[PDB]
Every structure is written in C-alpha cells, then in structure tokens.
C-alpha cells in the first residue's frame, strides 16, 4: 500500500543519477540532504530567470536566457557552445527538438 | 590539537569491534550518558567518526590519550616481546617502606633532567603492579608517540619486565631511573625473552608447580620390548614432571665445542654452530619426543632445564 | 664559472619590482624613462650573465629571513640546554 | 663578494651617460635600494650557514 | 547490504527526463510566467550539469579524509562551493 509525494518523485530521478556519478558507496543519511540541495537550487534557479527575462523587457522565458545564465556559470565558453553540450549529454529524441538539422529538400526543423 | 585527535583515532582503530565497549567503559573519560547516544550497530568507520567528534567537543589532552594506549595495551599484551630485569641491593641495607608517590616523582625527575622533553604515564594496576608508558625525546626533538616503551614493575620485588621496541638507545638511562626510584644499587638484564608475559612471570617467580602432598585388550597381540617402553615412560615422567608446562615459543643455543668423531682428528679449533628451536608450544613438543621414538630416554640437560634455570639463551664451550 | 640561474631569476624579479615602485611615484615622462630603464635592466642582465664567479651554493633570497629566525630559536634552546647539562 | 665591485663600477658608467636630472635621481634611488638588498641577503645567507654548522657542532656537544 | 549504506548504481536508469515534474515546480514558484514548450528540456540539461559537479566535489572530500564511504559532512561541504558557483 504505497503512497508517494509527487515532489519526492521528481527528486528521486536526480538522486539515483547522483549515485551513478559518485562511483563510491554512499551513506543513506547523505541521500536526503542532497534532496535538500536540489530544491534550493531550483528555487534560486527560478529567481535568476526572472531578472534576465525582466531585463530584456519580455516576461516569457526564451532559450537564449538559459544560454546567458550558463555562460555566467562557466559551463558555456567560447570553445564549448550550447549545441556541443546537448550532443554530449542528451539522448537522440531530445536532440531532434533542440538542435536544428536540415533534411529532405533543405527543410530545417526547428527553424533557425 | 590535531595531533591528539589523530593519536586517539589510530588507537581506537586498533581496537577490535566486539570489545570496544569494555575498553571505552574502563577508560571512562567520556561521560556515561554520552555513550548511549552513539550506536555501535553501524559501520566501524561511522562509530570512530562519531567518537572523534564527541571526544573533540570535550577537552582532550595528550595524557588521556596515553592512558587509553596503556589500557588498550594491557588487554592484548602479546603484541610485543618482553625482557626481564633484576635489581640487587647491599647486604646491610634495611627493608624500605615503599611509597607510590615518591616512586613516581623520582622516576619522573631522573628522566626529566637527563633528557629534556619526555612523556611518562602511570596506571596503578591491581595485584601489586605498575604499568608505565614512556615516549622518548631529547632537548632538540619533540617526543615520539609512535614508538613508546612499556615497563611493568612489581613493587617490593627485584623484578621488572620491559618491552624491547626502541629501548636500545636509552637502556642505561632507564636502568638508572629504575634503580634510583626503587632504592637499589645495581641492575642486570636476565637473558630470558618471550612473548607470553604471564609465562615469563610464572617462571621468574617460580610458581609454575603448585602441587603439594598433604594429608588433610585383544590379548592375541603380544607386545615385546614392553619393559623398554615402560622404562622410557618412567624416565620422561621423572624428568619433565607432572605439572602443566609453562608456554614458551623459542630457545637458542650457541655452540663452540670441538668435533670428536679419522675425521678432523688433527684439527684443534672449535666447530662454530648456532641452532634454534621454534614451536607453538615448546616444552610440550619436547616432552613427547622420547615416547614417540625420536630421542633417547633421558634428554640432554640443556633441554630439560629451561624453567628451573630461568634461562632461554645459552652459550656452551668445551 | 658562471653563477646559478637562481641569482638572475631573483635579481630580475626584484628589479621589475623596484622599477614598478619607482614608476608608481613618477607622474610625467613615462615612455622615455621606462625605455631607458628597460635598456639598463637588459644590459645588466647581459653583464651579470657574462660575469664569472668561483663556485658556491646559495639558498633563495625569499626564505632566508624565516629560516634565520628559526636558527636563532634553535640556537637559544640548545645553548640553554647545554648550560643546564654542564651545571648538573 | 668578489663580484661586488663589478656591479659598483656599472653605476659609474650609467650616471655619466644619462643626463636627465630626474632620471639621475631615480637611478641613484633604486641603486641604493638594490645595494641594500645585496648586503642584506649576503649577510643573512652567510650567518645562516655559519649558525647551521654551529648548531650541528653544539648538538654533538650536548649528546 | 545494510539499509543505511547504498552501493553505487552499476546501471543508470533510462535517460528519459521527468518533463512533467519540471513544469509544475516551475509553475508553483512563479505562477505568472509562461515557459516555452522546449524550455523544460534545457532546464533538465542544466540540472544534470549541477548534479555532475556535486558528485565530483563530494568524492574528492571523501578521498581527502581517507574515507571509503561518502558521508554527510563531505557532501554539505561540497554543497556550499557548488551552490555559489552554480548561481550566475
């Protein structure tokens, strides 16, 4: 008779992925405070997205706002673009929606 | 200090898991109510991590770390090989009135003046013994806590047992400290070494024999040589006694005798040899040689005279 | 024999430091003064590289002071220890 | 020690060739500074080695 | 294996992202906004690189203290450095 908090369902995905990268046995008490770290990151992440959108004069959040954030984070540099990072870390089905490629009569999707 | 924390962590890591609670209870530096907060069901590493935090929250010096080391040591006491000292006194000297505090002060002062930096600890043991732990240093070096020296001194008696780790450098100094603190004129080292401190103690105090006499089958097989078997059994019983033998593990003999057998008759110089005996329980393997047929009925006295002579290393000349 | 590479390393570094200090306090006449100072510096580097000295061993100039202080500390400790032993 | 006069003789040729009075003053200033550095480092290194051998001998003495 | 300590995952779960979860969390905190249809995926990418950073820093702390099991004090120390670095 299981009952699961929907909020904990989302965090459980990244918590398991954490144990894959660690490559060390990890104590149970370390698990839940990583969950504590994640929600703090999400809260502060959303706050930053407000200002960058607000500065541009549009309330809607567009991808180039996310590019601007990651450049300040140091993830995106002159050599490593946004397209390069998607290729390395995301599956094929997610790649089609994000990165545009021309095919079948020079048709490009998404339009860029 | 970080050094005392590392010292305590290493000492605790040495302790086996099942008996850690008894050691912690005997040490009793940490408050009793603090102990049940820690859980010993979990991993050893987690337990030591928690214990370091508890002992760091309270003030921990180096003296209590040394005390923990002494307490851990006297539980195992077979991790080191021990040696014996004997002290002698003048004929007209009167029997002294031993005082523990004066002994501690004198043994403190001799080391304190001869060297400069030195740590010595005491743990007054039941049954009339004293445990001492010494960390050696000099004027221009801090004491080395990795290589301590342990000595067990039995008060009112001429005997003291010491561990041979680093004592080679400062042997005369410790000899002087022991002979001054206890009011004895001379000291000599008995040539008897072992890893079983209790067997050494039983031999040295000669109390391994405690029996006092007081009044208060398939007849088809014929065994010839029966009289020889009964005679060798009687001789073995007479020579090796009937008490449980004290447990040793080693014995060494050095030989400088001439070869006497046509062969090397003209030679006039001794034949130089060195032989050693090793066994898990020596003096029990030796007892069984003659009945098994590997030795003659009486063994040579060099082998049957270990506990009576309180001797372990021998030298023989022609 | 020529002296070690460390001598030129240290002297070069201290000369950039002192040139920076003296240019810090000067207001006018920048280009000519810095060109003349750089020419003097490079010519002194050439002269000291060409120079010949009997062989010797030298420790780095930065750490001489602290090691010297610990040497005095050891001096005092060993002196007092020896005096006490002699008195006894 | 031996090469100390060599650096000193360099000061003579620099001063004669240069003419700007402020430049001459600057040359004098940092030349005095580097002379101070030379003397301090030489003396400190020399006394350091001397007291090092003294320490070795005197610890031998106490032993 | 004890309940208290979890062994490293040999096999990673399918790389599918929880798109529905990201939309609601972004919705509740800042209701007034509307996010573009593909913006959810990029947020997922941003979260991966954060967790990747957190795992590396935690491992170094555990090895520095000579610990074979990642502990809570190791990862909290990791959180302070990464969280400040993650904000830009």
XYZ file of C-alpha atoms in Angstrom:
669
model
C 0.000 0.000 0.000
C 2.391 2.708 -1.207
C 1.846 6.472 -1.164
C 4.464 8.755 -2.703
C 4.823 12.515 -2.526
C 4.822 13.800 -6.133
C 7.549 16.274 -5.177
C 9.764 13.413 -4.000
C 9.051 11.553 -7.246
C 10.832 14.216 -9.284
C 13.827 14.483 -6.967
C 14.263 10.700 -6.856
C 15.334 10.769 -10.510
C 18.323 13.049 -9.921
C 19.218 11.354 -6.636
C 19.725 7.988 -8.334
C 21.733 9.693 -11.081
C 23.911 11.190 -8.343
C 24.902 7.735 -7.093
C 25.901 6.707 -10.616
C 28.429 9.536 -10.977
C 29.811 9.238 -7.441
C 31.272 5.751 -8.071
C 31.562 5.186 -4.313
C 29.288 3.543 -1.748
C 27.268 6.308 -0.136
C 25.558 6.500 3.244
C 21.768 6.727 3.449
C 21.889 9.936 5.500
C 23.679 11.597 2.576
C 20.677 10.943 0.319
C 18.054 13.218 1.841
C 20.212 16.309 2.244
C 21.120 16.046 -1.437
C 17.361 16.349 -1.914
C 17.644 19.417 0.310
C 20.322 20.748 -2.042
C 18.200 20.186 -5.153
C 15.133 22.203 -4.147
C 17.345 25.098 -3.052
C 18.987 25.053 -6.482
C 15.583 25.066 -8.190
C 14.339 27.972 -6.062
C 17.427 30.086 -6.732
C 17.431 28.993 -10.377
C 13.919 30.357 -10.948
C 14.714 33.658 -9.216
C 17.644 34.276 -11.562
C 15.457 33.505 -14.584
C 13.105 36.315 -13.535
C 15.706 39.073 -13.737
C 17.253 38.081 -17.067
C 13.799 37.930 -18.641
C 12.724 41.107 -16.834
C 15.847 42.928 -18.024
C 15.064 42.137 -21.670
C 11.546 43.551 -21.304
C 9.702 40.290 -22.023
C 8.154 38.158 -19.296
C 8.272 34.959 -21.369
C 11.376 32.817 -20.859
C 13.237 32.036 -24.078
C 16.204 29.664 -24.522
C 18.756 32.444 -25.085
C 18.090 33.481 -21.492
C 19.189 29.991 -20.438
C 22.285 30.307 -22.624
C 23.169 33.605 -20.948
C 22.891 32.028 -17.498
C 25.111 29.049 -18.310
C 27.761 31.326 -19.794
C 27.915 33.134 -16.449
C 28.022 29.726 -14.763
C 31.177 28.883 -16.714
C 29.591 25.859 -18.387
C 29.383 27.622 -21.766
C 32.582 29.223 -23.053
C 33.934 30.395 -26.405
C 35.097 26.908 -27.396
C 32.164 24.937 -25.946
C 28.836 26.141 -27.307
C 25.279 25.290 -26.314
C 24.909 22.841 -29.200
C 28.032 20.933 -28.142
C 26.704 20.419 -24.614
C 23.390 19.000 -25.858
C 25.178 16.488 -28.092
C 27.223 15.040 -25.236
C 24.607 14.627 -22.509
C 21.192 14.107 -24.094
C 19.540 11.213 -25.960
C 18.556 11.312 -29.612
C 14.854 12.063 -29.115
C 15.644 15.183 -27.091
C 18.312 16.205 -29.603
C 15.866 16.495 -32.510
C 13.682 19.074 -30.760
C 16.636 21.181 -29.622
C 19.348 21.172 -32.316
C 18.215 22.069 -35.857
C 19.287 19.940 -38.836
C 18.347 20.421 -42.480
C 16.989 17.444 -44.402
C 14.625 16.364 -47.180
C 14.788 19.343 -49.510
C 16.673 21.840 -47.273
C 13.785 21.828 -44.782
C 15.159 22.742 -41.350
C 13.500 21.830 -38.050
C 13.341 23.706 -35.784
C 13.519 26.805 -37.973
C 16.757 28.701 -37.377
C 45.016 19.836 18.800
C 45.044 17.735 15.637
C 47.897 15.508 16.829
C 45.943 14.242 19.841
C 42.907 13.667 17.618
C 44.963 11.583 15.188
C 46.548 9.666 18.071
C 43.152 8.828 19.582
C 41.714 7.856 16.196
C 44.611 5.492 15.483
C 44.379 3.906 18.931
C 40.628 3.356 18.543
C 41.087 1.955 15.031
C 43.432 -0.651 16.503
C 40.730 -1.869 18.908
C 38.579 -4.830 17.783
C 34.896 -4.072 17.314
C 33.400 -6.620 19.709
C 35.413 -5.479 22.743
C 35.411 -1.725 22.044
C 32.697 -1.086 24.641
C 34.676 -2.650 27.506
C 37.746 -0.556 26.660
C 35.622 2.590 26.485
C 33.979 1.747 29.816
C 37.321 1.155 31.549
C 38.790 4.363 30.117
C 35.618 6.254 31.227
C 36.982 9.611 30.082
C 33.764 10.226 28.149
C 30.624 10.667 30.216
C 28.407 7.608 30.545
C 25.303 9.425 29.292
C 27.184 10.281 26.097
C 27.808 6.623 25.258
C 24.236 5.537 24.506
C 23.904 8.399 22.015
C 26.399 6.579 19.792
C 25.146 3.392 18.137
C 27.575 0.506 17.664
C 25.311 -1.427 15.282
C 26.511 0.587 12.283
C 29.853 0.579 10.485
C 33.141 0.763 12.385
C 34.166 3.847 10.410
C 30.984 5.709 11.368
C 31.474 4.808 15.035
C 35.033 6.145 15.090
C 33.935 9.287 13.228
C 31.294 9.964 15.865
C 33.610 9.154 18.780
C 36.226 11.600 17.484
C 33.606 14.361 17.432
C 32.455 13.591 20.976
C 35.997 13.487 22.364
C 36.895 16.670 20.471
C 33.892 18.595 21.803
C 35.251 17.954 25.284
C 38.807 18.972 26.106
C 41.202 16.110 25.342
C 44.871 16.368 26.313
C 47.745 14.036 25.482
C 47.713 12.441 28.942
C 44.307 10.811 28.473
C 45.371 9.558 25.039
C 48.395 7.929 26.679
C 46.089 6.434 29.312
C 43.904 4.978 26.559
C 47.031 3.495 24.986
C 48.036 1.851 28.281
C 44.524 0.463 28.786
C 44.446 -0.969 25.268
C 47.930 -2.434 25.699
C 47.326 -4.321 28.927
C 44.376 -6.118 27.331
C 46.393 -7.621 24.476
C 49.975 -7.705 25.898
C 51.072 -10.379 23.384
C 51.827 -7.922 20.565
C 55.320 -7.288 21.986
C 58.219 -9.478 23.093
C 59.258 -8.872 26.695
C 62.564 -8.951 28.577
C 63.369 -9.190 32.274
C 65.494 -7.069 34.616
C 66.841 -7.953 38.049
C 67.906 -5.479 40.737
C 70.231 -6.187 43.654
C 70.939 -4.381 46.952
C 73.750 -4.144 49.565
C 73.996 -6.642 52.488
C 73.480 -4.139 55.368
C 70.654 -2.153 53.680
C 67.338 -2.237 55.676
C 63.911 -3.172 54.152
C 62.342 0.008 52.628
C 58.775 1.365 53.156
C 57.528 1.684 49.561
C 55.600 4.846 48.716
C 53.937 5.135 45.316
C 54.039 8.930 45.077
C 57.762 9.104 45.843
C 58.487 6.410 43.252
C 56.527 8.347 40.639
C 58.330 11.593 41.481
C 61.822 10.071 41.379
C 61.219 8.212 38.121
C 59.839 11.475 36.743
C 62.790 13.622 37.802
C 65.602 11.376 36.572
C 64.191 11.293 33.036
C 63.243 14.981 33.191
C 66.785 16.076 33.993
C 68.745 13.646 31.811
C 66.646 14.354 28.718
C 64.517 17.468 28.278
C 61.254 16.516 26.565
C 59.719 13.223 27.687
C 56.209 11.940 28.468
C 55.721 9.227 31.094
C 52.385 7.820 32.276
C 51.304 5.612 35.168
C 48.378 3.215 35.639
C 48.362 1.648 39.094
C 47.268 -1.927 38.419
C 45.556 -4.277 40.848
C 47.556 -7.243 42.257
C 50.541 -5.057 43.181
C 51.894 -3.986 39.792
C 52.553 -0.715 37.975
C 52.281 -0.004 34.253
C 54.449 2.754 32.765
C 54.424 4.181 29.236
C 57.343 6.349 28.116
C 57.635 8.453 24.964
C 61.253 9.280 24.201
C 62.595 12.701 23.273
C 65.614 14.945 23.714
C 66.440 18.633 24.091
C 66.038 19.355 20.377
C 63.236 16.939 19.379
C 59.639 16.548 20.488
C 58.626 13.176 21.987
C 57.854 10.395 19.504
C 54.436 8.928 20.276
C 54.681 6.211 17.614
C 57.378 4.196 19.436
C 56.678 4.083 23.182
C 58.199 1.832 25.828
C 56.182 -0.148 28.373
C 57.562 -1.447 31.668
C 55.740 -3.457 34.341
C 57.245 -3.006 37.800
C 56.219 -5.223 40.714
C 56.725 -3.211 43.894
C 58.606 -4.725 46.866
C 60.280 -7.178 44.441
C 63.550 -7.125 42.467
C 61.942 -7.782 39.058
C 60.694 -5.543 36.247
C 59.524 -6.560 32.769
C 60.156 -4.257 29.807
C 59.223 -4.247 26.132
C 62.033 -4.151 23.573
C 60.973 -1.633 20.925
C 63.327 1.378 20.990
C 64.959 0.949 24.418
C 68.346 0.157 22.834
C 69.280 3.840 22.614
C 68.375 4.780 26.209
C 68.905 1.498 28.070
C 71.402 2.760 30.720
C 69.211 5.771 31.480
C 66.125 3.651 32.147
C 68.270 1.300 34.206
C 69.421 4.202 36.373
C 65.892 5.566 36.722
C 64.548 2.193 37.843
C 67.397 1.516 40.265
C 67.208 5.001 41.801
C 63.427 5.283 42.127
C 63.189 1.949 43.969
C 66.363 2.322 46.106
C 68.517 -0.442 44.602
C 72.253 -0.264 43.954
C 72.800 -2.494 40.898
C 70.796 -3.885 37.984
C 71.401 -6.637 35.414
C 69.429 -7.997 32.461
C 68.275 -11.609 32.627
C 68.803 -13.480 29.352
C 65.232 -14.735 29.049
C 62.876 -13.335 26.411
C 59.349 -14.361 25.471
C 56.079 -13.114 24.019
C 53.950 -14.569 26.853
C 54.287 -12.165 29.775
C 52.339 -14.467 32.103
C 54.604 -17.440 31.368
C 57.632 -15.225 31.989
C 56.050 -14.143 35.267
C 55.347 -17.723 36.372
C 58.905 -18.805 35.569
C 60.575 -15.768 37.155
C 58.574 -16.028 40.378
C 58.948 -19.847 40.071
C 55.309 -20.639 40.790
C 54.522 -22.952 37.865
C 54.478 -26.026 40.150
C 51.695 -25.763 42.735
C 51.031 -29.385 43.767
C 51.801 -30.119 47.427
C 51.319 -33.515 49.070
C 49.319 -33.141 52.290
C 47.010 -35.450 54.250
C 44.031 -33.256 55.117
C 42.743 -55.667 25.317
C 42.977 -58.023 22.327
C 45.232 -60.496 24.097
C 46.213 -62.079 20.772
C 48.714 -59.273 20.155
C 51.965 -59.728 22.081
C 53.999 -56.593 22.776
C 57.693 -57.305 23.007
C 60.020 -54.506 24.104
C 57.420 -53.718 26.778
C 59.981 -53.166 29.543
C 61.836 -50.592 27.449
C 58.597 -48.705 26.796
C 57.679 -48.632 30.481
C 61.199 -47.514 31.412
C 61.221 -44.651 28.905
C 57.786 -43.591 30.142
C 59.022 -43.540 33.743
C 62.142 -41.552 32.826
C 60.125 -38.995 30.858
C 57.675 -38.577 33.736
C 60.514 -38.073 36.225
C 62.409 -35.600 34.046
C 59.534 -33.418 32.812
C 57.405 -33.537 35.959
C 53.633 -33.813 36.123
C 52.571 -30.140 36.177
C 51.288 -28.224 33.145
C 54.320 -26.843 31.342
C 54.618 -23.052 31.002
C 54.136 -21.938 27.413
C 57.214 -20.765 25.540
C 57.825 -20.483 21.815
C 61.595 -20.271 21.246
C 65.005 -21.333 22.557
C 68.523 -20.634 21.286
C 71.879 -22.363 21.833
C 75.357 -21.232 20.780
C 77.986 -23.959 20.467
C 81.778 -23.618 20.471
C 82.755 -27.250 21.080
C 85.281 -29.446 19.304
C 84.318 -32.105 16.781
C 85.116 -35.554 18.203
C 84.313 -38.411 15.827
C 89.539 -40.392 11.413
C 87.545 -37.228 10.662
C 89.100 -33.898 11.694
C 91.252 -35.555 14.353
C 94.173 -33.204 13.689
C 92.000 -30.081 13.922
C 92.495 -28.162 17.167
C 89.904 -25.389 16.741
C 86.243 -25.469 17.799
C 83.408 -26.016 15.345
C 81.201 -22.916 15.327
C 77.434 -23.511 15.272
C 74.182 -21.779 16.233
C 70.875 -23.650 16.497
C 67.321 -22.590 17.397
C 64.117 -24.380 18.437
C 60.714 -22.952 17.481
C 57.260 -24.326 18.276
C 53.765 -23.016 19.059
C 54.014 -24.735 22.462
C 57.630 -25.602 23.218
C 58.344 -27.803 26.266
C 55.283 -29.765 25.178
C 56.733 -30.921 21.872
C 59.968 -31.782 23.698
C 58.125 -33.862 26.296
C 56.687 -36.143 23.602
C 59.880 -36.870 21.646
C 61.180 -39.849 23.647
C 57.897 -41.836 23.775
C 57.495 -41.308 20.024
C 60.963 -42.773 19.449
C 62.776 -39.709 18.056
C 65.046 -39.218 21.089
C 66.729 -41.312 23.756
C 65.102 -41.983 27.111
C 66.858 -39.196 29.069
C 67.175 -35.990 27.075
C 70.284 -33.894 27.486
C 70.034 -31.488 30.441
C 70.266 -28.474 28.121
C 66.686 -29.152 27.025
C 65.051 -30.096 30.337
C 66.450 -27.146 32.331
C 64.559 -24.142 30.927
C 62.150 -23.231 33.774
C 64.391 -24.387 36.622
C 67.315 -22.251 35.455
C 65.119 -19.355 34.222
C 67.258 -19.414 31.094
C 66.325 -19.103 27.452
C 69.551 -18.310 25.568
C 72.608 -20.485 26.182
C 76.320 -20.482 25.387
C 78.397 -23.674 25.502
C 82.181 -24.023 25.419
C 84.370 -27.117 25.533
C 82.373 29.675 -13.620
C 79.024 31.392 -14.179
C 76.688 31.758 -11.231
C 73.429 29.827 -10.951
C 70.194 30.578 -12.804
C 68.553 31.392 -9.460
C 70.659 34.522 -8.997
C 69.412 36.041 -12.262
C 65.850 34.879 -11.571
C 65.819 36.651 -8.200
C 67.667 39.777 -9.355
C 65.463 40.094 -12.437
C 62.311 39.770 -10.321
C 63.458 42.292 -7.727
C 64.355 44.734 -10.494
C 60.887 44.564 -12.030
C 59.510 45.125 -8.530
C 61.712 48.158 -7.865
C 61.079 49.570 -11.358
C 57.348 49.251 -10.709
C 57.789 51.040 -7.378
C 59.766 53.928 -8.885
C 57.325 54.296 -11.798
C 54.485 54.319 -9.258
C 55.734 57.595 -7.757
C 56.576 59.281 -11.091
C 53.917 61.268 -12.965
C 55.297 62.610 -16.260
C 57.850 61.368 -18.804
C 56.723 57.737 -18.925
C 57.834 56.246 -22.244
C 61.411 57.541 -22.280
C 62.065 56.683 -18.631
C 60.684 53.157 -18.994
C 62.616 52.563 -22.223
C 65.872 53.704 -20.614
C 65.186 51.607 -17.511
C 64.409 48.521 -19.615
C 67.598 49.025 -21.633
C 69.619 49.351 -18.423
C 67.916 46.258 -17.000
C 68.603 44.084 -20.049
C 72.208 45.291 -20.280
C 72.707 44.483 -16.588
C 71.257 41.024 -17.236
C 73.793 40.553 -20.032
C 76.642 41.810 -17.831
C 75.732 39.538 -14.916
C 75.300 36.542 -17.233
C 78.756 37.232 -18.681
C 80.229 37.590 -15.180
C 82.465 34.879 -13.708
C 82.465 33.759 -10.070
C 84.116 30.948 -8.066
C 81.664 28.100 -7.411
C 79.339 28.357 -4.412
C 75.884 27.354 -3.136
C 73.188 29.926 -2.340
C 69.685 29.467 -0.926
C 66.769 31.500 -2.248
C 66.542 35.104 -1.085
C 62.850 34.989 -0.160
C 63.123 32.424 2.635
C 66.416 33.467 4.276
C 64.722 35.578 6.956
C 62.355 32.962 8.384
C 64.947 30.175 8.357
C 67.340 32.571 10.080
C 64.729 33.253 12.769
C 64.219 29.542 13.435
C 68.004 29.190 13.529
C 68.210 31.764 16.325
C 65.398 29.955 18.152
C 67.285 26.652 17.900
C 70.440 28.497 18.971
C 68.872 29.740 22.192
C 67.225 26.417 23.037
C 70.388 24.377 22.502
C 72.518 26.917 24.387
C 70.308 26.841 27.478
C 70.117 23.043 27.365
C 73.895 22.680 27.176
C 74.378 25.173 30.010
C 71.953 23.267 32.241
C 73.638 19.935 31.497
C 77.068 21.401 32.249
C 75.854 22.844 35.553
C 74.443 19.477 36.632
C 81.701 39.287 -2.530
C 84.256 39.097 -5.337
C 81.820 40.416 -7.961
C 80.551 43.277 -5.774
C 82.963 45.874 -7.276
C 81.816 44.825 -10.756
C 78.255 45.952 -10.049
C 79.603 49.119 -8.416
C 81.628 50.116 -11.481
C 78.460 49.827 -13.574
C 76.899 52.708 -11.628
C 79.723 54.995 -12.768
C 79.122 54.487 -16.493
C 75.334 54.768 -16.190
C 75.459 58.138 -14.427
C 77.870 59.727 -16.911
C 75.848 58.669 -19.963
C 72.467 59.761 -18.571
C 71.624 63.468 -18.415
C 68.026 63.891 -17.216
C 68.180 65.104 -13.619
C 65.029 63.260 -12.530
C 66.348 60.135 -14.251
C 69.671 60.544 -12.430
C 67.825 60.817 -9.116
C 65.783 57.702 -9.910
C 68.924 55.748 -10.833
C 70.513 56.751 -7.533
C 67.406 55.763 -5.575
C 66.917 52.244 -6.868
C 70.672 51.672 -6.966
C 70.776 52.396 -3.231
C 67.798 50.061 -2.840
C 69.439 47.173 -4.710
C 72.670 47.747 -2.781
C 70.665 47.331 0.425
C 69.139 44.119 -0.938
C 72.588 42.789 -1.870
C 74.124 43.467 1.529
C 71.160 42.116 3.495
C 70.904 38.877 1.505
C 74.662 38.251 1.598
C 74.917 38.806 5.352
C 71.812 36.746 6.126
C 72.938 33.793 4.000
C 76.459 33.843 5.448
C 75.308 33.962 9.069
C 72.692 31.310 8.280
C 75.328 28.836 7.099
C 77.621 29.741 9.999
C 74.939 29.154 12.609
C 73.896 25.944 10.854
C 77.355 24.443 11.310
C 77.346 25.861 14.847
C 74.080 24.029 15.579
C 75.466 20.743 14.266
C 78.588 21.051 16.422
C 76.682 22.096 19.539
C 74.091 19.312 19.336
C 77.041 16.947 19.018
C 78.386 18.592 22.184
C 75.193 18.080 24.193
C 74.966 14.467 23.040
C 23.821 -4.911 2.252
C 22.662 -2.772 5.240
C 19.712 -0.329 4.743
C 21.902 2.611 5.974
C 24.540 2.391 3.157
C 23.553 2.219 -0.571
C 26.103 0.746 -3.077
C 26.993 2.706 -6.273
C 24.450 2.119 -9.103
C 26.074 -0.194 -11.676
C 23.470 0.603 -14.343
C 21.954 4.032 -14.871
C 18.212 4.291 -15.338
C 16.843 5.279 -18.721
C 17.946 8.763 -19.697
C 14.317 9.900 -20.064
C 13.697 13.183 -18.255
C 10.756 13.901 -15.911
C 9.281 16.673 -18.042
C 6.002 16.835 -16.122
C 7.731 17.373 -12.783
C 9.785 20.317 -14.054
C 6.728 22.153 -15.380
C 4.796 22.013 -12.102
C 7.736 23.052 -9.914
C 8.432 26.000 -12.205
C 4.699 26.757 -12.165
C 4.112 26.878 -8.407
C 7.087 29.115 -7.620
C 6.450 31.727 -10.343
C 2.829 31.304 -11.494
C 2.656 34.497 -13.561
C 5.173 33.315 -16.160
C 4.691 31.113 -19.205
C 7.545 28.868 -20.353
C 8.185 27.900 -23.962
C 7.399 24.327 -24.972
C 11.054 23.257 -25.227
C 12.309 25.259 -22.242
C 11.662 22.297 -19.952
C 14.332 20.205 -21.684
C 17.054 22.842 -21.298
C 16.259 23.139 -17.588
C 16.775 19.376 -17.359
C 20.167 19.759 -19.041
C 21.093 22.468 -16.539
C 20.177 20.181 -13.643
C 22.368 17.354 -14.971
C 25.494 19.514 -15.043
C 24.783 20.628 -11.478
C 24.489 17.067 -10.156
C 27.603 16.086 -12.106
C 29.514 18.892 -10.377
C 28.174 17.882 -6.962
C 29.250 14.251 -7.355
C 32.828 15.131 -8.325
C 33.359 17.533 -5.423
C 31.920 15.118 -2.854
C 34.223 12.303 -3.988
C 37.322 14.471 -3.543
C 36.384 15.346 0.041
C 35.829 11.692 0.951
C 39.186 10.661 -0.513
C 40.922 13.595 1.190
C 39.775 12.324 4.598
C 40.657 8.718 3.632
C 37.022 7.587 3.826
C 35.672 4.820 1.596
C 32.017 5.851 2.120
C 30.699 9.289 1.196
C 29.410 10.920 4.376
C 27.050 13.802 5.098
C 29.734 16.262 6.229
C 31.578 15.635 2.959
C 28.584 16.462 0.766
C 27.414 19.502 2.746
C 30.882 20.997 2.297
C 30.513 20.229 -1.406
C 27.133 21.977 -1.481
C 28.444 25.332 -0.246
C 31.039 25.686 -3.011
C 28.880 24.382 -5.857
C 25.700 26.286 -4.978
C 27.503 29.634 -5.048
C 29.285 28.634 -8.257
C 26.004 27.439 -9.795
C 24.388 30.884 -9.431
C 25.386 33.459 -12.049
